[PDB]
Swiss-Prot record, chains A, B:
Family: Belongs to the transient receptor (TC 1.A.4) family. STrpC subfamily. TRPC5 sub-subfamily.
Disulfide bonds: C65-C70
Encoding gene per record: Trpc5
Tissue: Expressed almost exclusively in brain, in mitral cells of the olfactory bulb, in lateral cerebellar nuclei and in pyramidal neurons of the hippocampus. Very low levels detected in liver kidney, testis, and uterus.
Signal peptide: none
Cytoplasmic side: 10-24
Residue stretches spanning the membrane: 25-47
Protein name: Short transient receptor potential channel 5
Length: 81, 81
């Protein structure tokens, strides 16, 4: 609801021609996004297939924290998610 | 081999009558040894029977130390030994 004040820039002479030039840049990231998506799901598979034998539990870890976003990161290549 | 210099105390007049009085004290600890052994064998069983469900391993424990004599003692009532 707060990002809708950008449709008012067309009524000014300085900020007007800037939105039109920004509209074209967003037609260049699509193809690189496609290629990057393929390169990422390709690699997301081998690493998961190699490390899924050493998955521990939470109660056997310090402070009962499992995964990244803890203070000491652990169990980063266990599942596919 | 070094505790055999106590068999020479009988040739002196000060240390002589001390070995003979010490020889009698060692005939009082036997009965209390009997009672204490029964009282210890009695209690050594319930505590082992109550705690033998939560026995962890040694890779889950910090610094790979299991049992008493570590810096942080753990697994004290797991087995009978």
């Amino acid at each position: 609801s707060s990002l809708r004040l950008i449709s008012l820039f067309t009524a000014n002479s300085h900020l007007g021609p800037l939105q039109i030039s920004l509209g074209r840049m967003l037609l260049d990231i699509l193809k690189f996004l496609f290629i990057y998506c393929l390169v990422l799901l390709a690699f997301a598979n081998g690493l998961n297939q190699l490390y899924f034998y050493y998955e521990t539990r939470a109660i056997d870890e310090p402070n009962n924290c499992k995964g990244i976003r803890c203070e000491k990161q652990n169990n980063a290549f266990s599942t596919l998610f």
